[PDB]
């Protein structure tokens, strides 16, 4: 599998979440929970060039 973190904001202090499987992320991201998108980024490695969930293609991973 492949988990994907998600941050509501784009700051270095903002809340850091998204330790769920791409499957769980796709649900929330697809369900519509994020109407504006979130700072999505693979958990490992920790801390990288984050990317908006709306700019990622989970379909090319699951």
């Amino acid at each position: 599998d492949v988990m994907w973190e998600y941050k509501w904001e784009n700051t270095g202090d903002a809340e850091l979440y998204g330790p769920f499987t791409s499957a769980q992320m796709q649900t929330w991201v697809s369900e519509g929970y994020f109407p504006d998108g979130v700072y999505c980024r693979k958990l490992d490695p920790p801390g990288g060039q984050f990317y908006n969930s709306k700019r990622i293609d989970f379909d090319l991973y699951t």
């Binding site: 809340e15 979440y17 929330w28």
Partner: peptide
């Protein structure tokens, strides 16, 4: 199928 509320939120 269903799922719980994601972290962070704001209420």
């Amino acid at each position: 199928s269903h799922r719980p509320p994601p972290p962070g939120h704001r209420v």
